[PDB]
């Protein structure tokens, strides 16, 4: 019995009342909770009345695995209209995230070696580590000025600035001077534009351009002006490095984009568009998981002490060779795995399937929109015993970890992101105890990225 | 819905508060303990000022000192009260720092406006001034509460074996309820500048 598509349960949602509820609330902050309860109601697969085209929502490793077996040579995601629209309006090309087909593959293969490959990590990870050491030094100096050898603060601003700085050094070889100092205005303008770009993305992504162009034209100008600001920021970084390399081609590693420009395999215009993706995508995606981990570690001091144990043991060798932090802190890497299971920045994986396939023994025809919701996936009590528990051992004992996606489209920035998170934690863990009174669950909110709605007050006590 | 600190209390709620505040705020015993902390900030004021003075060719600086004195007192009191060092002496005013100085000044002005007439009358004669006054207090309470939430959470986890300030003593002893401590801590924070 391979049951026909229609057999599959249907979402009780009306495509139209959803558009209207998004128009009204100016967002969809509860998307993750809705999809979750629907999965509790109707089992691990269901279909959404999209008005003709075929959407299917899953949440099992089982299903993701099959899905990787039907990635074409050109795995395809759905056009994100608002982002592409802006590109075409200002006459830019599209980077890897907004491409499909031949052009995607041509870009991707000329990007993996310098952004994602192990040989690239080895070169940029020391630079990241330099910024992470600086983050903790700056924090230690503040802490030691206090009589109780501790500082209690909302760490979100300084963690966001660390990701800006670490990403910038890795990407462009420049030190912006945003760790252990104040935010610049260019810094805050950039963070603000990212926030607004994301907010407006939700508004415009859930109704065709057809209607949005006249229903919410103010949302369009808002989205474009946010992108204008983001591009202004990213272009200035590009203008700098471009001018510097035109006069001197260095003999030592000075970051990822340099490698791209040096090789000149991609066109400048294609390099420009991919740098903007890396520059824009390297801030919030990383900052938030990092904050959630600090929060979880502060609620679970026993787990924190275990993670401290190993970071102190490896302290020695890592400062000699930073590159070994990947291999030598496997319990800390498990913690990240654990943070992204409970709080996945990318809420759902997405494929418009090029062939027909079978999931949960239902027939899924080609051209179907298939969405894996990692929030519900991560919380399946079956695959994850004691799902609510924050237990990195869970990972040492063992498609259960796919918060970065899968196959050839999987996150291009994965190794950078993981370096940035791992190194900051490691250096913090050698030097500080992290504590909070605010032990209650933080409510996640969905604005394209899935992010904490609240920022708890964390105490950093020097050891 | 906040409690009143010792300044605004009369009667036995007052006496209860006062007798649980004299020892750590006013006594010579408490002064022996915070005076060295205050000395540090004073020393720092004088060094920061000297660095600037010696950069000048006549070996003097000529300025309106008011801003830097106000930042000295904010720093001194915050160290004495909460045992934290704000970084305001020898550096530029932070924006929390300036908002607080402004909020205080507006709170004092509006006080005089509303002070000499009953609420029954001032309600409709000067309602925009009640708004100003309450906004000033919101900002003051915002600043004072940031301070206290920091110390509270620090002291719930570790009781230091040494002196880390006046409000630390009150919280350690916990003779007054939290709400009472918060109320009195606001008066010392607002009143110490
Ligand atoms: C913890 C942080 C991050 C998470 C959880 C994350 C997650 C993801 C996910 C789920 C995808 C979709 C993969 C798929 O469709 O199979 C993706 C793609 C992508 N990510 Fe990330 N990401 C993170 C950080 C970053 C960073 C820092 C960058 C840039 C440096 C980045 C750049 C990209 C790009 C360019 C793609 C598109 C790749 C393609 O379509 O071929 N990501 N990421
Ligand atoms: C992770 C994500 C895909 C990758 C992007 C990220 C948001 C920030 C971002 C900006 C870019 O210019 C490049 C891709 C990227 C890093 C998205 C948020 C949700 C989405 C997904 O959930 C993918 O399945």
Residue of B nearest to A459 (CA): B154
Residues facing A459 on adjacent strands: A152, A435
Residues facing A363 on adjacent strands: A358
- DSSP symbol at A5: G
Among the bound ligands, the one closest to the CA of A256: 1
Asked if A455 has any chain B CB less than 8 Å from its own CB, the reply is no
Work out whether strand A54-58 and strand A369-373 pair parallel, antiparallel, or are unpaired: parallel
Neighbours of A233 (CB within 10 A): 20
Dist CA A130 CA A406 (whole Å): 30
**Which CA distances in Å does A155 have to A239, A288, A457?**
32, 11, 8
State the smallest CA–CA distance between residue B156 and chain A in angstroms: 8
Residue range(s) defining the domain that contains residue A89: 1-463
Neighbours of B36 (CB within 10 A): 9
CB A400 within 8 A of CB A310: no
CB B165 within 8 A of CB B82: yes
CB B117 within 8 A of CB A422: no
- Three-state secondary-structure class, residue A372: strand
Q: What are phi and psi of A57, to 5 degrees?
A: -110, 125
Dist CA A165 CA A203 (whole Å): 30
Way it was determined: X-ray
Residues facing A46 on adjacent strands: A57
Instruction: Report how far apart the first and last C-alpha atoms of chain B are (Å, whole number).
Output: 25
CB A372 less than 6 A from any atom of ligand 1: no
Asked if B146 has any chain A CB less than 8 Å from its own CB, the reply is no
Residue with tokens 């993706």: A277
Asked if A461 has any chain B CB less than 8 Å from its own CB, the reply is yes
Token duo for residue A214? 């006249």
- By C-alpha distance, which of B146, B186, B151, B145 is closest to B168? B151
Q: What is the DSSP string of A208-256?
A: -HHHHHHH-HHHHHHHHHHHHHHHHHHHHHHHHHHHHHHH---SS---H
Dist CA B118 CA B139 (whole Å): 25
Dist CA A237 CA A255 (whole Å): 12
Residue count of chain B, please give it. Answer: 193
**Domains contained in chain A, number:** 1
Å from CA of B182 to ligand 1 middle: 46
Q: What are phi and psi of A36, to 5 degrees?
A: -60, -50
A348 annotated ligand binder: yes
CB contact under 8 A, A147 and B84: yes
CB A285 less than 6 A from any atom of ligand 1: yes
In this structure, what CATH number is given to the domain that contains residue A295?
1.10.630.10
Count of H-run helices and E-run strands, chain B = 9, 0
- By C-alpha distance, which of A179, A174, A150, A148 is closest to A424? A179
CB A200 within 8 A of CB A222: yes
Asked if A459 has any chain B CB less than 8 Å from its own CB, the reply is yes
CB A94 within 8 A of CB A240: no
Residue with tokens 């590109």: A87
Work out whether strand A362-364 and strand A357-359 pair parallel, antiparallel, or are unpaired: antiparallel
Dist CA A97 CA B121 (whole Å): 65
Q: What's the resolution in A?
A: 2.5
CB A67 less than 6 A from any atom of ligand 1: no
Tell me which chain B residues have a C-beta less than 8 angstroms from the C-beta of A152.
Answer: 149-150, 153-154
Q: Which residue among B37, B152, B160 sits closest to A148, beta carbon to beta carbon?
A: B160
The C-alpha R_g of chain B, in whole angstroms, comes to 19
């Amino acid at each position: 019995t391979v049951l026909p598509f229609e057999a599959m349960p249907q979402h009780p949602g009306n495509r139209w009342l959803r558009l209207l509820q998004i128009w009204r609330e100016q967002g969809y902050e509860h998307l993750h909770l809705e999809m979750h309860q629907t999965f509790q109601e109707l089992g691990p697969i269901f279909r959404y009345n999209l008005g003709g085209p075929r959407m299917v929502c899953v949440m099992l490793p089982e299903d993701v695995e099959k899905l990787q077996q039907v990635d074409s040579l050109h795995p395809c995601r759905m056009i994100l209209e608002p982002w592409v629209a802006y590109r075409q309006h200002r006459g830019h090309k599209c980077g890897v995230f907004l491409l499909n087909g031949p052009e995607w593959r041509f870009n991707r293969l000329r990007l993996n070696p310098d952004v994602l490959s192990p040989k690239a990590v080895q070169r940029f990870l020391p630079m990241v580590d330099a910024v992470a050491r600086d983050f903790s030094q700056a924090l230690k100096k503040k802490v030691l000025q206090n009589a109780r050898g501790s500082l209690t603060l909302d760490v979100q601003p300084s963690i966001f600035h660390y990701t800006i700085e670490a990403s910038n050094l890795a990407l462009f070889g420049e030190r912006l001077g945003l760790v252990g100092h104040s935010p610049s205005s260019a810094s805050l303008n950039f963070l603000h534009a990212l926030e607004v770009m994301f907010k407006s993305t939700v508004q415009l992504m859930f109704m065709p351009r057809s209607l949005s162009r006249w229903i919410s034209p103010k949302v369009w100008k808002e989205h474009f002006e946010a992108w204008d600001c983001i591009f202004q920021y990213g272009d200035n970084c590009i203008q700098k490095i471009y001018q510097e390399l035109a006069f001197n081609r260095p003999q030592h590693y000075t970051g990822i984009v340099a490698e791209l420009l040096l090789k000149a395999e991609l066109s400048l215009e294609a390099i420009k568009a991919n740098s903007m993706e890396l520059t824009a995508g390297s801030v919030d995606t990383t900052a938030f998981p990092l904050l959630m981990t600090l929060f979880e570690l502060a609620r679970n001091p026993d787990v924190q002490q275990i993670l401290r144990q190993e970071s102190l043991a490896a302290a020695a060798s890592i400062s000699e060779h930073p590159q070994k932090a990947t291999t030598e802190l496997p319990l800390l890497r498990a913690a990240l795995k654990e943070t992204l299971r409970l709080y996945p920045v990318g809420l759902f994986l997405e494929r418009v399937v090029s062939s027909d396939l079978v999931l949960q023994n239902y027939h899924i025809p080609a051209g179907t929109l298939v969405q894996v919701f990692l929030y519900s996936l991560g919380r399946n009590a079956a695959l994850f015993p004691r799902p609510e528990r924050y237990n990195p051992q869970r990972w040492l004992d063992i498609f259960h970890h796919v918060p970065f996606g899968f196959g050839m489209r999987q996150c291009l920035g994965r190794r950078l992101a993981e370096a940035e998170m791992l190194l900051l934690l490691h250096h913090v863990l050698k030097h500080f105890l992290v504590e909070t009174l605010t032990q209650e669950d933080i409510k996640m909110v969905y604005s394209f990225i899935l992010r904490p709605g609240t920022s708890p007050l964390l105490t950093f006590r020097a050891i």
